[PDB]
């Protein structure tokens, strides 16, 4: 099976096992199962990641300009700033989604697309 | 009669095929759908209890 | 074979009847259960 390692530039955020991982790379939406061919893809500015693992609820991650590396054993997501759904302040996301700054707006959109919004 | 017997045997073969390979999945998908309906229908009720 | 006849109406009415029964007793009800 897959083991999803969401590692930020500052610290490692998540390293548990997973069965399926979905994210919006710059080439479109991509879903990865075990034994997927090695791949390197840049996530979009507002990319969100959804992880499906044995038993636990689906895990939604807001990712800021990350990169996805499918490897023989690990699908590693390298992120500048990654936030779980449980850490999202929804009102802050809604406010930031309309920010003039392109990067701040993209990060707010990523937080919303995780929030289920 | 011969035409009727032949088409009836064909109908029986296709009926067996669907009953042994198409009926099971449709049946169980529906099973799960209903089971989840049940679960959620309940949730609401219990959360009203909470 | 390709030339239409009165059946065009005879089918149509029946379809409309169905389009009624579904549009009243099926469609809205299912939407509402939804």
């Amino acid at each position: 099976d897959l083991n999803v390692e969401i590692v930020a530039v500052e610290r490692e955020l998540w390293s548990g096992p997973a069965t399926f991982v979905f994210t919006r790379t710059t080439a479109g939406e991509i879903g990865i199962l075990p034994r997927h061919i090695p791949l390197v893809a840049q996530l979009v500015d507002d990319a969100m990641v959804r992880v499906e693992r044995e038993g636990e609820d689906d895990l939604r991650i807001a990712v800021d300009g990350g990169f996805l590396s499918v490897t023989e054993e690990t699908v590693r997501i390298l992120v500048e700033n990654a936030q779980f759904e449980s850490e999202i302040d929804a009102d802050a996301a809604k406010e930031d989604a309309a920010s003039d700054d392109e990067r701040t707006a993209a990060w707010g959109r990523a937080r919303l697309r995780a929030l289920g919004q | 009669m011969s035409i009727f017997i032949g088409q009836l045997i064909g109908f029986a073969v296709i009926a067996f095929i669907i009953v042994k390979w198409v009926v099971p999945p449709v049946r169980t998908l529906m099973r799960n759908q209903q089971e989840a309906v049940r679960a959620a229908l309940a949730e609401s009720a219990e959360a009203a209890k909470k | 074979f390709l030339i239409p006849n009165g059946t065009f109406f005879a089918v149509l009415i029946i379809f409309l009847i169905v389009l009624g029964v579904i549009s009243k007793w099926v469609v809205p009800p299912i939407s509402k259960v939804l």
């Binding site: 710059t26 080439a27 090695p38 791949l39 840049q42 | - | -």
Partner: protein, 43 residues
């Protein structure tokens, strides 16, 4: 940066655009590592 050939995968949509998007990120990561190294050395 100097390319060092040390001797002996798919990419989306192309490896050139990923390289262009990643080199700035790599330089940012190396500057971050340098700043962390400087903080540890300062302490």
């Amino acid at each position: 940066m100097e390319v060092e050939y040390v001797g002996e995968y798919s990419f989306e949509p192309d490896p050139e655009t990923l390289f262009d998007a990643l080199l700035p990120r790599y330089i940012a990561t190396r500057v971050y590592a340098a700043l962390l190294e400087a903080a540890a050395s300062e302490s």
